[PDB]
Design a protein around this ligand. Sequence first.
Ligand SMILES: CC(=O)N[C@H]1[C@H](OC[C@H]2O[C@@H](O[C@H]3[C@H](O)[C@@H](O)[C@H](O)O[C@@H]3CO)[C@H](O)[C@@H](O)[C@H]2O)O[C@H](CO)[C@@H](O)[C@@H]1O
Ligand SMILES: O=c1ccn([C@@H]2O[C@H](COP(=O)(O)OP(=O)(O)O)[C@@H](O)[C@H]2O)c(=O)[nH]1
Ligand SMILES: [Mn+2]
Length: 273
Amino acid sequence: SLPACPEESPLLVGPMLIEFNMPVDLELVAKQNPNVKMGGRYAPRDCVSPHKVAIIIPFRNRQEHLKYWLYYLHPVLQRQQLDYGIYVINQAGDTIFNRAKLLNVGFQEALKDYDYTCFVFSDVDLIPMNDHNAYRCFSQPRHISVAMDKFGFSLPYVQYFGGVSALSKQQFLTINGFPNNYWGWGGEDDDIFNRLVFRGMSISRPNAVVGTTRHIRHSRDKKNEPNPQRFDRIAHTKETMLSDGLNSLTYQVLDVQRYPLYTQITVDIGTPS
Ligand SMILES: CC(=O)N[C@H]1[C@H](OC[C@H]2O[C@@H](O[C@H]3[C@H](O)[C@@H](O)[C@H](O)O[C@@H]3CO)[C@H](O)[C@@H](O)[C@H]2O)O[C@H](CO)[C@@H](O)[C@@H]1O
Ligand SMILES: O=c1ccn([C@@H]2O[C@H](COP(=O)(O)OP(=O)(O)O)[C@@H](O)[C@H]2O)c(=O)[nH]1
Ligand SMILES: [Mn+2]
């Protein structure tokens, strides 16, 4: 019998200063975040959060971005009073990148740790500027990174659903999760948007001030070149989503490391079939 947490956290400070030009030492971040437990798990000591959140980051060869991510998000996620865990889904090998398949791995593997009922899918290079931007689920699928600096602090188009988002366990299951066959850059977030609409849902978003988000500038990743089949794929989601996703997923976990501030799941997700 801890009480429920207040519906909105009283700890929040709003707008925050974010910068990416200093070094980050995860040992020190760990000491600055003493309440974050092994594998990057935290729940509040004083009340029970209804938000059981697994944060899923698709990842390969972005360790520097990830330290920033961890330095900025951990304090924010605790102020939001979430019962949360961080999962970095690391794609083994050096073949073409598959953001959405790694996201599916994250959903399925996090569920083996704990009864999570909310999933935040976050690119590793996106940091929220205002802690009023809730990193948890809503009654409709939630788009979080709504006002990114690299798109002029607004949406690049109104159906944009990339960057950072949150789906309840029921929402993600309803759309058969995410597509597995978007290899290389582009389109998979649009396909996911399509899925949600085809299943009767609409996108919920904070306002453009609360939703303000920074992207860490970086040059192009090798092995994630624009997918030329992306425009064709997103035109057929309605039919393809029925049998491409959670119900067609396999992968092989090579390694799970519990670090102080995150669990990292190293996974072989194959190449195109
Ligand atoms: C189907 C698809 O590709 N969806 C993308 C969507 O694509 C819109 C166009 O993006 C251009 O590339 C832009 C990119 O979107 C920006 O991030 C960046 O600042 O500049 C590049 C290059 O100018 C392509 O040139 C064009 O053909 C389309 O692909 O963009 C969104 C937002 O990036 C993405 O999440 C989604 O997957
Ligand atoms: O080699 C790669 C390619 C992409 N990603 C992950 O997938 C996301 C999407 O790619 P990208 O950086 O090109 O999109 P951007 O955020 O620049 O708009 C990244 O933020 C990372 O989380 C990664 O870790 N390594
Ligand atoms: Mn990026």
